[model samples]
Target: MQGQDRHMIRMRQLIDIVDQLKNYVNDLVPEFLPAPEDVETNCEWSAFSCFQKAQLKSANTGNNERIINVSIKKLKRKPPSTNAGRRQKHRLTCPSCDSYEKKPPKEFLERFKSLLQKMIHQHLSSRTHGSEDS
Candidate 1:
């Protein structure tokens, strides 16, 4: 049952993050982010969610027994690619970095908005198509 609890917690965390990002883009907008199944089909979104899972797991070490103050650094590190060493100077941006900010960056927000909308559209289309076929 522990695994089931963790999975449930993971889904909740994912939904909360998605909702937070949607709000981050625009507080007035009332759109729903797609489910985890749809989200997993996207590259960047999946990567972001996977990173969050790692962060969540790491954050659970806290207990009444002792205090652990370890930093959750290097969470933004991406897998190595074929790019040249100089091209790899810059690191991948962390979605969590701007989470603490009063507002997310304009560029990041715009990109996120576009990508999220695409996922929503695709999910809606799939559901509609499935119903139509049935």
Candidate 2:
């Protein structure tokens, strides 16, 4: 059953997730800052300082220690090859997370980004419009 022993992640799917994560971050930033990138360095709202905790926690720090650590992740190659297999095994235990792993090419992610953009745009529009209430 290969359950939890190690799971294979397809390269194509990982790239799709990465693009989505990138776009999602880009879309969410404007609302928090004004200039965002120009004289906008205003840094008033302090909105651009998130993600400060993403560090290689597994790396050894002690001088006497091995001072070594390898990233447990890689950006798999597209198509991989004629018969190299489409999955990479990793020591992660997530049957649930894995259940949503296999997907038809360009199927769910397109819909996800579509729905997400519409949802976020609608929410922001409502805010910029009116509350027609007391």
Candidate 3:
């Protein structure tokens, strides 16, 4: 029973860590996108400046558009679902940096995902051993 209790406590701690990490990621989005009022100015329909246009066009093809559209639609339905919605509440541009510049920095997202995975593994392992000791 003590072992079970210890495992439960560790599991709870792991869950709390996951929630905190999620909140952190969500909060970081706005740092990369434009504010709500500035969305139009930042990403006007097909008005991409040379640099921005190139980036936008690069992603306008096929799967990219589908993903962006889906994300936008979801955001509209649930504004508070992310940090991007904490302000003006629009889906035209990145809810984070508001960059109309097509692709987001892949490295950042990849790193964040990796961190989450690592945390989960560590948490689970720690919980398993914690139960054994108890």
Best by TM-score: 3
lDDT (10s digit) by residue, model 3, range 1-134? 34555544433433343343333443323224211222233232212121121221113434344444333232222111333334564554543333433323233333222332333235355444331221
lDDT tens digits, residue span 16-133, model 1: 4444443433322222222122133434444343332333112233341111111122222232242212342343422322222122223333333333444433533554432122
| C-alpha lDDT of candidate 3 relative to the true structure | 0.31
Off by over 4 Å in 1: 1-41, 47-104, 126-134
At residue 43, what lDDT does model 2 achieve?
19
Give the clash count for each candidate.
0, 0, 10
Residue pairs that clash (backbone atoms under 3 angstroms), model 2: none
> Which lDDT values do the candidates have, in the order given?
0.32, 0.25, 0.31
The numbered model that scores best in lDDT is 1
Off by over 4 Å in 3: 1-58, 68-104, 126-134
What would the per-residue lDDT of candidate 2 be over residues 1-134, giving only the tens digit for each residue?
Answer: 45431113422333344344333332221121111111111111121111111111221334312221211122122222322123442332221111122222123223332322323224234445432322
RMSD (Å) of each candidate, 1 decimal: 13.0, 19.5, 16.0
Better of 1 and 2 by lDDT: 1
Candidate 1 vs candidate 3, TM-score winner: 3
